[PDB]
Amino acid sequence: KKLSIYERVALFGVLGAALIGAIAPKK
């Protein structure tokens, strides 16, 4: 079984460049 392990880590810390690499808050 698995999910949160790949949802809270492979989505909660992987989009750091997807949500920040678009709107450009300070990039």
DSSP for 1-27, please give it: --SHHHHSSTTTTTGGGTTTTTS-S--
Which amino acid, residue 17? A
Tokens of 3: 């999910």
The number of residues in the chain equals 27
Which amino acid, residue 14? V
Residue position matching structure tokens 């949500």: 19
Tokens of 7: 């949802």
Residue position matching structure tokens 């392990």: 5
